[PDB]
Design a protein around this ligand. Structure first.
Ligand SMILES: Cc1nnc(-c2ccc(C)c(-c3ccc(C(=O)Nc4cccc(C#N)c4)cc3)c2)o1
Length: 349
């Protein structure tokens, strides 16, 4: 049953959405798509509506649109962005050219929180608990966020948290250059392309975020990739032979070996006054060798979270088939796959 759609121009972009969505108001714009806040009269929810930008413009864009839609349709967890609705005004595959994604409206991110509020140790426990709870879920489906930073973590007035803006495409080189938050939370192996990276890249970002919640300050605010690596090695120590061997990039390996060796610092002397259990956890997250970092499931059982940990309420995700990542398809094939996923969507309760 096709709802009735209505048309409006919001910032020289035409929005064609079902009647249920009212009071559309531009809230953001990028190469990803334009975003509007709206009121969903059907559910009574304040929602964010994203209009994808030229979703089927190239093979790469079509595959990306399919990827984003597949990912959002899968994620069903309190601490992870989920999909309330997806629609298109198209009546057939032949006229299908726009995809609109509907989610909860977020308002505030953790960037806003860290800047404008005093976070007690109890707040840090709760906020980091939820991130790890969501990441246990995401990682259980072999999904890596890759881009966790405070601006990608929405927090409501009750300090309730959702993970959003999954890394879906390489940032440009320019975007990662210089004194920029876009790089400060990245694991060094991914920042410098040391090796085939894994899901603990996300645990590294959690360590950086947790530290910032505790001190109110960026942990590794490098002025460039190399300055940042130096900030990192100063804290955690220069790599040993065992990690060196795992750096498959001969060039990177040769560079790190040029550095004066440095021991890991005392974290109690960096995080002065912090809960000793918070310090212990940071030590387990901020490990250079990604093989040896604590995982999300392991971290949830750490004594730091004794107050919030409930092993019966830390769910894993349904299996997630990402074999499409391996296919080279034509635009029209990606578009048809995307169409199927739009028309098969079932809203949550
Ligand atoms: C991959 C992937 N990971 N997340 C997505 C995704 C998809 C759709 C939406 C709508 C969103 C999304 C959800 C919420 C918001 C949001 O509430 N933005 C915002 C920003 C600033 C102010 C206001 C307000 N009022 C609202 C923006 C975007 C994210 O895709």
């Amino acid at each position: 049953e096709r709802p009735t759609f209505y048309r409006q121009e919001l910032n020289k972009t035409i929005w064609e959405v079902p009647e249920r969505y009212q009071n559309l108001s531009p809230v953001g714009s990028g190469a990803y798509g334009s975003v509007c806040a709206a009121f969903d009269t059907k559910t009574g929810l304040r929602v964010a509506v994203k209009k994808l930008s030229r979703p089927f413009q190239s093979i790469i864009h079509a595959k990306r649109t399919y990827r984003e839609l597949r990912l959002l349709k899968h994620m069903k967890h309190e601490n992870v962005i989920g999909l309330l609705d997806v629609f298109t005004p198209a009546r057939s595959l032949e006229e299908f050219n726009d995809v609109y994604l509907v989610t909860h409206l977020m308002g505030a991110d953790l960037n806003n929180i860290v800047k404008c509020q005093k976070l007690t140790d109890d707040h840090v426990q709760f906020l980091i608990y939820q991130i790890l709870r969501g990441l246990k879920y995401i990682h259980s489906a072999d999904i890596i966020h890759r881009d966790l930073k405070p601006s990608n973590l929405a927090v409501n007035e009750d300090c309730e948290l959702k993970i959003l803006d999954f890394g879906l495409a390489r940032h440009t080189d320019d975007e990662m250059t210089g004194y920029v938050a876009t790089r400060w939370y990245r694991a060094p192996e991914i920042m410098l392309n040391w090796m085939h990276y894994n899901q603990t890249v996300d645990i590294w970002s959690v360590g950086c975020i947790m530290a910032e919640l505790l001190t109110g300050r960026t942990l590794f605010p490098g002025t460039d990739h190399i300055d940042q690596l130096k900030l990192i090695l100063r804290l955690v120590g220069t790599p040993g032979a065992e990690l060196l061997k795992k750096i498959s990039s001969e060039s990177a390996r040769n560079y790190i070996q040029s550095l004066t060796q440095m021991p890991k610092m005392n974290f109690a002397n960096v995080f002065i006054g912090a809960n000793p259990l918070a310090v212990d956890l940071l030590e387990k997250m901020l490990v250079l060798d990604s093989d040896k970092r604590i995982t999300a499931a392991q971290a949830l059982a750490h004594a730091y979270f004794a107050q919030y940990h409930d092993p019966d309420d830390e769910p894993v995700a349904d299996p997630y088939d990402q074999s499409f990542e391996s296919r080279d398809l034509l635009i029209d094939e990606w578009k048809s796959l995307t169409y199927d996923e739009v028309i098969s969507f079932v809203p949550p309760p």
